[PDB]
Design a protein around this ligand. Sequence first.
Ligand code: HEA
Ligand code: HEA
Ligand code: CUA
Ligand code: CU
Lengths: 63, 535, 236, 269, 100, 353, 48, 57
Amino acid sequence: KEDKLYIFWGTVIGIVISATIFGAFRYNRNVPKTMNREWQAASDEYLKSKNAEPFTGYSQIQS
Amino acid sequence: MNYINRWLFSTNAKDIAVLYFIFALFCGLLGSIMSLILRLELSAPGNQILMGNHQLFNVVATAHAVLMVFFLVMPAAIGFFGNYLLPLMIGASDMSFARLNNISFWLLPPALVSLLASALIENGAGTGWTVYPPLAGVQSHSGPSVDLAIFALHLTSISSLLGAINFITTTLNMRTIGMTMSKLPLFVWAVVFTSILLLLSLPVLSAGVTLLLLDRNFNTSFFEPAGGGDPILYQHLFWFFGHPEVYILIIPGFGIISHIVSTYSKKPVFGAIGMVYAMGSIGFLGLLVWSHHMYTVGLDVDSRAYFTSATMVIAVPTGIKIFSWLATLYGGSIRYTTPMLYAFAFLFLFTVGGLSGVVLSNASLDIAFHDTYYVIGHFHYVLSLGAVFSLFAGYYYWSPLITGLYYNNNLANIQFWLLFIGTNVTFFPMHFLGLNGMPRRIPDYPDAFAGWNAISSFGSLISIISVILFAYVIYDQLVNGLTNKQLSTNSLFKNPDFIESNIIFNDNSIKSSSIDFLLTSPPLPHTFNTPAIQS
Amino acid sequence: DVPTPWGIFFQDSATPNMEGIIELHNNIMFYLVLILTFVSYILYTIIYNYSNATIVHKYMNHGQLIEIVWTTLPAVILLIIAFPSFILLYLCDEVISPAMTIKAIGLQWYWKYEYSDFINDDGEIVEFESYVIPEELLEDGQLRLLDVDASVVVPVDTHIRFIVSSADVIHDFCVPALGVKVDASPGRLNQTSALIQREGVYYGQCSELCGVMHSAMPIKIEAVSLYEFINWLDEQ
Amino acid sequence: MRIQNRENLQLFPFHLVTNSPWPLTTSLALMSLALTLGLTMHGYIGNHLWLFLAISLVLSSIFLWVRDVVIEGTYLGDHTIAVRKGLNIGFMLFVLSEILIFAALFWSYFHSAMGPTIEIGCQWPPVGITSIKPTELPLLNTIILLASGATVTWAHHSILYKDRQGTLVGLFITTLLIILFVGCQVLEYTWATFTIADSVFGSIFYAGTGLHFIHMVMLIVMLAICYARMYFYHFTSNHHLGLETTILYLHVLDIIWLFLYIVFYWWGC
Amino acid sequence: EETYEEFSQRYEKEFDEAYDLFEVQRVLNNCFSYDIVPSPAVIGKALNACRRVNDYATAVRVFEGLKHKVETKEQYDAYLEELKDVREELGIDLKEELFP
Amino acid sequence: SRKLILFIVFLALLLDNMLLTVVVPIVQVGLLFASKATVQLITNPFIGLLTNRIGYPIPIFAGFCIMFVSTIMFAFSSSYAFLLIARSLQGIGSSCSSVAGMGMLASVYTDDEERGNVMGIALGGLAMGVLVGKTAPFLVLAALVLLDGAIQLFVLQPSRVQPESQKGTPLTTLLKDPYILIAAGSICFANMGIAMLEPALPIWMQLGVAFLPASISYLIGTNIFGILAHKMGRWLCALLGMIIVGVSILCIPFAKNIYGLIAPNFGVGFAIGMVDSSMMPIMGYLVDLRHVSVYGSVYAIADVAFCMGYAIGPSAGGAIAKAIGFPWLMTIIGIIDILFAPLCFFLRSPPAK
Amino acid sequence: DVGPYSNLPFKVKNRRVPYAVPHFLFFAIGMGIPFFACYVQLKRSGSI
Amino acid sequence: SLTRIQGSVKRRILTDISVGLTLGFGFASYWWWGVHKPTVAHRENYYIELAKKKKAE
Ligand code: HEA
Ligand code: HEA
Ligand code: CUA
Ligand SMILES: [Cu+2]
């Protein structure tokens, strides 16, 4: 009974470290000019005038 | 001088397997760091780590393909488990051609040097793993990089051919007194059936690579369409090697799983003759299909219909093996030790990665999936989760017998769960990126493919931590490993039964179906003086 | 059409061939889901019932009826899968009268389009080259690494035959919505056929590796009406 | 096993090789050959006397293996009935692998002969390339090979009837009946009208009949070491495995030449 | 291919010829490894076989395996109301009466 | 299109020799072994007249269905009379399939140079059945290929009865010609020796390794000499083939061991392959030169000459082996095969009409 | 001398430098070479 | 009576195959009648509205 707790709390502290490493490579990114909300709202008007994705959905907004 | 005549000038077959293991560990570390370099660039849109260089992205992908198709999986599955276990299972002292075993080892460190020197003298060799003719000419790659990379696929070919002839010649006339070739264990049959494909596939690859070399440097024009040749010929002469190759990587895994399923579930394997016939059928039907990698090149309409028919037939023998493994695990008692965890995680993920192969077999459906990340997600569920899992299970099964030193159970379980979680996070959104339409071999992508690329960059950092924990497991095995056999009862090879008392069990401890687990555990240098007897 | 950010499934169709592809994939997924659920239920039963058990049935090792049932039952599934696959392979192609031909030659890192008809007596064939718009010169709202300076403009409800070749290395023409994926190898011509049912814009990317600028080579197809196509062809 | 003094001799009929250094040296020679051939073909070295040292060291490494193969069989005396069967199975599985290299080269011929491209105006042997007439020197080579296949049967049937002069003469005649093949085929490569670079036709004709040239230098060497080892009394009337491997290697090359003469030299249209 | 009335004769013959504790536990181990449960006559022979070799724990562990082989609880109590004069003559106590 | 017909004919010949030869793993024995060949010999000329009436594709799939139901009746048959009936229906199905398939390859491929190559590929199925585990993968591969054939022939385009536009010459008019008979005799006397060698080989002397080199050499011989027979002349290939069959047949009595039979067996099989792929296209050439072009009855005659050896072989071979013995039987068949070879020169240029 | 530390090419116990340094340097080189290759080919092509 | 038990595992096998297939067919008949057919219906009703607008014009 005192070994399954050890395996569980060994896997949790293996997932927490990788999240903190990946977060450090996430603040320091090269963000291009197209990834902004005021640029992905201008693309929706062009995709609305020339009718695109009629059945499902079109939305280029992901902030 | 005794160091030289025993670890450099060697004859013993079991002492080359440990050198194969030490080489395979290094060549599986290098490619994994190269894969971490790729996955840290394919994270968010833009040009992040490699500043603007689209060379040194294709070079990294090529060198990550070669170092783990040719330098990790084959040396582990042929050198460490084939050279060591096959003489002990069939009951022979050593191999039939021992000096050929020594040359088959020592051809590989000169093959590593040329591949590492194919990425420093020039721009590099960014041709992909499949070195296609009209890109790898003297108009895009003009330098000593492709030439030194196709000389690393000759030495490995010579080593594999010389090992396969040794494996076939040994099992024919070097058996014990009472073994016919119908009482052999299943691992010996796996090694035999991969050694026949190694004979029947490698001359075509050697011919195609040599003709590519003659086209590059002696202006011969086999595959140049300004003199009367076709590039498509090379594709034929590549893929006739290519599809036997990907069964060579997976057939030695299967037999290993059988032993674990036969051991920790205390039942014999359901239908062994059906299993060896199924492996024979899989080995034979891997040579009559090669053109399903080429459906978009412009073939006939009556030739696609043959290769859709001959590809879906291979599902029938593999299902026999899967359902026989289920029938073996059905009735018996199951104790969950660290080989059986990897065994249970292989019967589910090989099925998931293999059911995607039926979707790609159709020529009508391959128009939507060719050169797309669906293919990558298909073959990573089978290569990383089918072969590497079998390798880890084989290591955790046979390492106390070979080495004599035990390991901590808890850290091995933490390693297994970290591999499981990180690898299932990494390769599953590749199916979604493939279905939406992301092509292969691109550093930069449109902004719509961003979000899933943020998630598949997170599991790789989980898997590298599992590799580092595996390194610490090996270190804890080597130091203080004599005192790691009373912590847990995983060290016992088989458990006491219901009626079998403990006092009776300590007198008669090992019950087996092979010669392997009754030896003294360091295996002796000369392990059979008098011959073994089978009725 | 355009890719969507958190995509799970296919893009939307504008050609009968892509609808046949979608229908065949959704037919295969039925049997694959059935097989995966059967295997997963058997492992669940094995884990829940026969874990750390006192009784071992160590003599149930032969089987004779049950080995026929896992040999004939997958075969019937393969025949049922193989019927519509062959019908889709043979049936949906250019059986009757293509109405146009556009030659799409692939150079090193751009595309070259020739509309081979509409020939004058002197050889005044309409021709253009399509490049990629760089990130620095984009206007407000254009898609990065997919938007071009010249686009292939075709009518609706007209069979169009694409003949694809190359001049340098092996390329691959792709428009995902239209169901077109054919190679471009430097010494032979290849053909595909497309019929477009609704107006819009259709985007695509090259597939087979060609060198450093593999990620910047888009394909853009506009599907105008017939009057707009005639007015466009009298300007170029 | 119940013979009286049985402990003093080995209890299983298999050969335990002593420790030898030659696998490492072969690999170190192939390292030098691979890197020098990769480098001299693109600059970076200039002098062409390192490649020749690499080839010479490789060939001396194989010769130094075969010495220790001979001494362990005619002097130490460790070749039982089982080890001979293993060596025969081994050699058969290299002859089979050396056949399948020619299969790929034959399939590289029929993929262009049947269905030629548009750049060559659709025609075998194409316009401007005069082929080699098969009623000249390619007849002489065929009849010399068929005679050499007949003379070694008089050499293997004279070592079984214990006639020494009659094994030496036949091997001598065969050794001079393979040198003439090489001498004729080096004269057919200096009196030709088309090179390795003149078509896909001149590129596959000098790549299927050039591997055969390298494979027939090996018979001259293997027959020299079979004449010289018979002159010095190493061959008995029932234990000779050097002759049996050279006979199986010659006949496969004769059958391969009879398929390099109907497909390459006669069939052109 | 083997029927109930041949199983329940062959295992009686095997139980009436064991000479050591290894053999009694060997025949007892592969008797509980079929689809047929042992008959009340076979188990009555197994306790005399355990009496000849003089072991006590094996005579208790036979009755514990019946609780796992038998499907329900009513059949287990139907086994224990017929193997009662065997128990109270030799002296075997069940596990749930010892509380070990 | 045109290649799927080649696939269908290859599978038809494969199933022909698989259901003929492979009966033991999957006097009464002389009559039971030859029950298939004689009923095929009788019902071969009827299908040649039937294909002119009802057309090519229907008898092929009728023969496949008849073969399937006859094999499944043979699967659980115990009495002798029902077993004889079952093998008779197996033979009559296998007689429809091969004749109609070879006629339809003759009909579609009109060019003379392509016909030899395609029939050289198609005749290679006569040795894969001799070579041929679980075999359920291969049966469903065959079922998938015939599903493709049925989809293209009967589903996408409608098919009526549709009798042929021209009326062919009758069977007796073909039998009055000397060239067709003397072409058929080459195949008959070439296959007679390899037909008689099989039952007498357990008498003289494991089993599969003796027959394996002929199956290895046959495919290589037919696939090479289908293409190259156009430039060399087919009569010369027939002459050299009969010569090599005779020499390799006389090579067998001097052999005194099982391992000494490997080298002549190659010299059998390759040679008989060069007999077949040379001479079976040229029959379809002769009707295009002298008669009206209907290819049914001529390939019926060719299948008659092929199956005469397997019909007459074991029953006469056992009697000769009991009477005189193996080496004189091999000597007389070898001298017959060598002596026939001079007169195949007559097919160099037949007179046109 | 057959025993549990006899079949390995490296010495583990009774050693001057402790085994942690040769165990760590092996993995350090193995995960440090393909960054050196990228550094060299980045610096040869202008970019930092 | 209650002291005669002959077959127990075979009934378990026949139940565990006849539930793993009903569950499989249940989890596959939601993919074809709740995910697939309404998408084809939506696709068709989009196309029986684009033609009527062009007919009006
Ligand atoms: C790792 C080894 C491996 C394995 C095991 C397989 C397995 C299979 N592969 Fe191969 N394949 C590769 C190696 C491998 N492949 C690689 C590396 C690629 C990428 C190509 C690259 O870019 O170079 C590839 C890609 C690939 C493609 C895509 C080619 C392209 O991009 O267009 C195809 C399609 O035909 C294919 C075929 C198959 C098939 C049908 C199987 C099948 O064997 C899968 C069989 C599995 C099962 C079917 C499970 C059985 C379960 C049952 C219970 C049976 C039930 C019965 C039914 C399903 C009817 N493979
Ligand atoms: C050999 C099989 C194999 C393996 C193991 C992997 C490992 C991984 N691969 Fe895959 N990958 C391929 C097959 C494989 N790959 C191939 C063939 C290509 C080339 C395709 C192309 O060129 O077109 C490729 C390329 C490739 C790319 C580049 C795609 C491209 O450029 O188009 C990517 C990127 O996401 C990727 C993903 C990953 C990841 C994250 C891992 C991670 O799993 C890496 C981490 C590794 C481990 C988790 C295992 C460590 C192993 C050991 C240390 C165990 C040693 C064993 C013993 C002790 C017995 N791979
Ligand atoms: Cu250009 Cu791809
Ligand atoms: Cu494949």
